[PDB]
Design a binder for these strands. Structure first.
Length: 128
RNA sequence: CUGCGUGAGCGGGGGUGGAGGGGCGAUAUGUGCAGAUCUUGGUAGCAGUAACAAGGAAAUGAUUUGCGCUGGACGAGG
């Protein structure tokens, strides 16, 4: 089908590189979120041997698998019972997710609609 | 603890918590920090360290005995 052969092209493009800020393992006041250096003596900016590597557009994914869920579908966020309506002509390419702040009274209503329409839920079986 | 994004960042799950919180378009800005012998607050190592005190005794201590030298009044100040 759609999910099964895509999940193995997705795995061919997985990188395990992280892009962590220089010296963030040495000072607690430097946070790990990425920043580019500007110093007059900076060696990360020159790409010397041994230093951490910088991010760039040559690591970006093909358009067909970028943002794919691990099971092979696209994610949609759902707040209402009326949010499921557009997922009827396409219920084999999407996987719904119920927002965190929706209460358990309304979650019963959403979970029953999606069962009688054949729509996958990434989030069901929680807070029940 | 876990998913997505080259990245700035954005989601979901289990505890805690006990009242509010968001998306999208235009618009107004006191709009993003590692440094300034930066400002204010809190906290380490140094270190239980330097420095200081432990005043002669007699089971008891209104009794016996050993040592030091300021002692008593008026004014200012309190």
């Amino acid at each position: 089908f759609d999910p099964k052969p895509l999940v193995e092209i997705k795995e061919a493009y997985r990188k395990n590189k992280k892009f962590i800020r220089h010296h963030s393992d040495r000072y607690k006041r430097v946070k790990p979120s990425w920043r580019r250096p500007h110093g007059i003596d900076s060696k990360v900016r020159k790409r010397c041997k041994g230093e951490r590597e910088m991010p760039s557009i040559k690591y970006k994914k093909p358009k067909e698998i970028r943002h794919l869920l691990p099971n092979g579908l696209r994610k949609v966020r759902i707040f209402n019972i009326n949010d499921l309506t557009p997922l009827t002509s396409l219920n084999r390419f999407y996987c719904g997710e119920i927002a965190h702040a929706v209460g358990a009274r309304k979650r019963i209503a959403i979970v029953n609609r999606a069962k009688e329409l054949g729509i996958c839920l990434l989030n069901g079986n929680a807070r029940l």
